[PDB]
Symmetry: D2
Subunit: 451 residues, 4 copies
């Protein structure tokens, strides 16, 4: 019933960040009892400003403030620089609101490293149990991401093929046209690996690589996802160079306006990625030998996040009439900005005989964006928010998840920190550095785009 930010009068919060809070319930969903406690340097009535500062210790005892009943729960995000979190953690203690089920919502980066994340979580845990913790991951709230569960197990056509023999490899790519998210100097703090790959891509891979549960339970869903992250192939300095590629936002023509370089955008020489590509494997016994080719970067030629499952070829082209070449089957799922799923099959080409059979590849296409046009375009936060209020919530992260996510992340970065692996530049609007072609082409693979 309350959310805390110390910078609202200042910087981004003052101009664009706040409406996310006001807009989502102002005409959308329904809310009536809430007590937004804000502090900085319907429910319109609830919002109320306050002032707080970590530097004076005696100040924390003085604020002594709690809006709403103790039997409600204390959710808050401390968006401060490192070492200021510890000073202001106790403020809810002056309120004292830890006893009731507490939402403890954390839509946050959660730190650069597992020790960095654990430091946070160990301190948060003493006031609140895991059941109280409700960490949001913005993709898990996207509807297009949610249907990955109906897709495999609400249909009998897929699961026979999710097993190494069925799939030769899978390709995932999160595409963004612009690097101007207002994160410059904040991106430097993390970067595309921790910014995008550590949870949102990993959460998607978990939806793709897992086993089905027996039923749609909250904790049955999450307990099977940690298994993929614990079954990831750990990328070591001995494997990072072959399996990883970093690239950086350069100066090209992007979006119609010509644009400039990352380093020249920060003003100082910068080393973060703004693009990365990995060749992962799941060793659960259903995925051994199946490469997942993951990719994300900014200043790319299109913003379009899609998954492409390429299946193993037929054991035999019985149409080896000199026209018998069969293009592997692809299951293509597009989740942003258009909602789309398609399959690629072979069909005899209308015609006679040129001393063989000639055929074409073609796509059975279905688009959710068009099929459901009279339906809603609800924001992820609107679906996610009710679950916070609801006694058991399903779309929120768990410690085993993040802890298994970071281990793979920290093992990779040291691998190229121990290998001294600098990024490679790309022209904004090019699809990235030229080294990501060999990374797949050394395996025979091609990255799916338009024709």
């Amino acid at each position: 019933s309350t959310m805390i930010l110390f910078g609202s009068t200042g910087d981004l919060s003052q101009r664009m960040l706040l409406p996310s809070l006001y807009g989502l319930d102002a005409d959308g969903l329904l809310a009536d009892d809430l007590r937004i406690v804000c502090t900085s340097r319907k429910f319109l009535n609830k919002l109320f400003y306050a002032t707080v500062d970590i530097t004076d210790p005696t100040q924390f005892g003085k604020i002594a403030d709690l809006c709403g009943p103790v039997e409600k729960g204390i959710a808050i995000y401390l968006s401060t620089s490192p070492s200021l979190f510890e000073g202001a953690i106790a403020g809810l203690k002056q309120a004292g609101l830890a006893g009731p089920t507490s939402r403890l919502a954390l839509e946050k980066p959660l730190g650069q490293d597992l020790a960095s994340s654990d430091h946070i979580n160990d301190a948060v845990l003493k006031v609140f149990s895991e059941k109280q913790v409700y960490r949001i991951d913005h993709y898990l709230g996207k509807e297009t991401v949610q249907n990955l569960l109906t897709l495999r197990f609400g249909n009998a056509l897929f699961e026979p093929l999710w097993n190494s023999k069925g799939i030769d490899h899978v390709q995932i790519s999160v595409a963004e046209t612009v690097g101007l998210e207002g994160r410059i100097g904040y991106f430097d703090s993390s970067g595309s690996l921790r910014d995008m790959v550590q949870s949102h891509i990993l959460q998607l891979v978990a939806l793709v690589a897992m086993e089905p549960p027996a039923h749609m339970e909250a904790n049955a869903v999450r307990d099977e996802k940690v298994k993929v992250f614990r079954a990831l192939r750990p990328i070591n300095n001995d494997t990072v160079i072959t399996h990883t590629v970093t690239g950086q936002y350069g100066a090209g023509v992007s979006g119609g306006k010509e644009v400039a370089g990352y380093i020249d955008e920060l003003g100082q020489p910068s080393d973060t990625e703004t693009f990365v590509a990995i060749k992962a494997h799941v060793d659960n016994w259903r995925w051994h030998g199946v490469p997942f080719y993951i990719r994300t970067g900014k200043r790319l030629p299109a913003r379009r996040s899609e998954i492409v499952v390429q299946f193993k070829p037929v054991p035999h082209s019985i149409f080896s009439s000199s026209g018998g070449i069969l293009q592997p089957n692809k299951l293509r799922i597009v989740l942003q900005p258009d909602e789309t799923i398609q399959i690629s099959i072979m069909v005899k080409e209308p015609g006679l005989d040129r001393n063989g059979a000639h055929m074409r590849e073609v796509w059975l296409d279905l688009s959710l964006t068009d099929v459901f046009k009279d339906r809603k375009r609800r924001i992820a936060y609107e679906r996610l928010m009710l679950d916070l209020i609801e006694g058991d919530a399903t779309l929120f992260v768990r410690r085993d998840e993040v802890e298994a996510q970071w281990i793979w992340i920290d093992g990779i970065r040291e691998g190229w920190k121990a290998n001294s692996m600098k990024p490679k530049t790309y022209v904004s609007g090019t699809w990235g550095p030229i080294t990501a072609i060999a990374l797949v082409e050394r395996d025979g693979v091609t990255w799916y785009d338009l024709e």
Copy 2:
């Protein structure tokens, strides 16, 4: 290398060329050794025919005429071009005399190639008797029997679709598919065919040849390589494997319908008996539930329906796929319709697949979903290609080689054994046909045929 032609005057041969010719007079595909041979009961010359031919279309035309009782206008073909295949479309009475002349001319040979479009049978006795007179004169290597469905391009892609894709083969077995459905629908009543249909019946007209050929295409095992002989041998196996329909199963597995007088195209249409002017028990519609017993196909029902005066004209092959082993969306709110693959072969050429998808919205109570169809349209993709007219590649097959499209004896021998066994069985039970209203999809008892075991009927409704 060489082809001779018969029955030039009749509205059958000329009709197919009209639409094709206007689009194409250009192709000139045939090899030089072949030339236009025209024979009909006509007095137009060689020149004088190339004048009638031009309306259908002079460089390759040779004419000359014959008589149907005189084996003497038979030398006129002999006094015609012949360097160091034939098409006969006649009624039953002239069949052996027409064969008689070819032997006297010498135009009957191991070199000679035979093509036989007209109905070739009613029993084994016929099948064997009609073929055996041809067979003593000719071998299988010279006889190539036409099947008017087998040539449709949508049917040719059934081999590419099934065997050019690996997404179909893991589930193309008894465990993968709950049931297989084939439907051919005709809005039109027979027009001008009465007295020909009554002797054949609906089952002889469509089920014996085209529908059975389609059943094999879904059920046939793949050949090691695609050659007419390798592909055909597997198809014959499907006909041999088909479970025999006998008196015990005939009443349960077969429904027969005769079209009544109701309405077609917004106007009342008369009953089949009324058009004949004679009482008939012949069938204008048939429905069957059929099983092919094989390690791959044992226990999977295949249901075949073809009808006359049915509500719409379309031919569709729908293969339902087994329901998911567990509904992980239990506790209510989730219904998981099994996956279905629907392919349309008439009148639109189209393939679709059935998938389950969450409905846009929150989980709320239960998981809510819709089934939805991945749809592909074959006619639009090949827009720079031609249209639905046919009898095409079959020609190239003549000068170049053996034809996958043409029929062989063991199949026709296997078709009638299954088809003849059904007719005697409903003769021993005295199965009178059931009437239906023209445009209702057939007699309503054919609905129990599917509905008593849990099956329904696909409509885009």
Copy 3:
């Protein structure tokens, strides 16, 4: 480190009061529960049979297995320290813990790597996938009995005096309801004073889809994989072979068995009573042969839910004379389904 004995609980309230009072002092990592069954070599190889091999998995689902049979039969009684049966019956001792563990090691999915929680989590998922027999399902899906007087023996009551309403015999038709197993009845059976002692699992596979030879003499007997854990340690498979004979009337076939007896080769293995390894686990590492708090929860929930149904149906066991191979009524819980209790016959 604290290790607990076999009599942990008699119901939900018990094992949750006894544990959450101890889990108030200790934790799940430092807590070990004792299953006498788990630590046996023949049980240990079940996971080694399934997942160290590739021959079985292609069929280990509702599309390759017809039925499983798990039997543990005894000749003795409970002499020396009777009281637990009076307190718990024959349900809570051997089924709630011992045989349910044998149920888990056959109907579970593989972990990525052999580690305690990763292996245990797959078993917990089974005990959650157990279809709960409740209400008016326990009469037609369960059979109870009591060993009578016969063979000098006297009955249980005809040796104890007081009237009790608890069975020394239970028959269930269990059901794991997951993608892998939906549709596969699991047949669990145990009891005392029966004419044999051999604990064994039997997995009957479905019949081949079509029979080429089934016209005359075509009796196609299904293939069954046989495993014997107690007291014989024996794994076999039933296969169909041609009868060498000059036959003029159809195909002649015999059901024969690929036989394997592991003790005969496992002599070098220092065969010993099961408990000797269990101590080292507690002494030097993570407990893989021990039950977990979530394992106890899903066991008792499915163990107690039946008790709801038969005390409301006021269900009483059915007398079998000792040596009646059980009550004759456990023969119809399968004969109504066509299946019959297997025997080497």
Copy 4:
């Protein structure tokens, strides 16, 4: 041929049929020349070709094991199995018909039909219903799915040998193989991608003809620890003169903290001969006489099988006479020429031998 007696005695007639057990061919033309001459008087129904090995009882059981059970076929696919190995070895000198043995080889005698039909009963699909030509019809497609060993593949896909000697017993310049090794390939959906290892010979120190089917490896090894290695699981079959069939499984070897976790490769063993010892113990030729009269027999080879046998037999012979290959003497009991071991040992495969008598320390 001297069949000329029968037709010029009025004997080639419908009352009576024929079964042939003669050295019919050395090439496709000779059997067809024999066949065309016999089919010049008869048709295939009254023309029967006899293969001794088909007629052995334990050989008869190959398809019933394949098709009376549901455990194998799920794996009888390229995905299911890695490779097949067929071995037929003899103890005798090549002297039983030493002059006759020269000019036919061990290929056209033993492999062209006997072991190729052992190939046929392995790489076939099930027919509709058992019928005399239904069995044959699925073997023809096998004999058609046999990759024709190329003159470019005959160096890396074949190995020949000689009794060490055959020259020292026959006189004339001899290039005759007292041993043969090939690696065949069935190119159908079910089988494309599976090495078929065929091996036979006469100057070897053992006599037990056997088939071995190795199934593919597991995707993931959950039990990753020291000591525990996994040999792939295999099917072993021995029919003559021993009838002994086993399966390779991985079973735990009990130990406490000794050399890590322990797993043994042990065998489910079954011998038909002990079970049926009270039974016939007949001669492979016994029933074949009853099938011919008033009947359609399943157990006879057909001209297209022998034709497709010969076509695949001749395609090698041109090619290895084109590579000018000569046999390699092996000194009287070395399990073959030293080169047939690399035909697998380079491919990772090793020639399978009984674990007892194959191990040391």
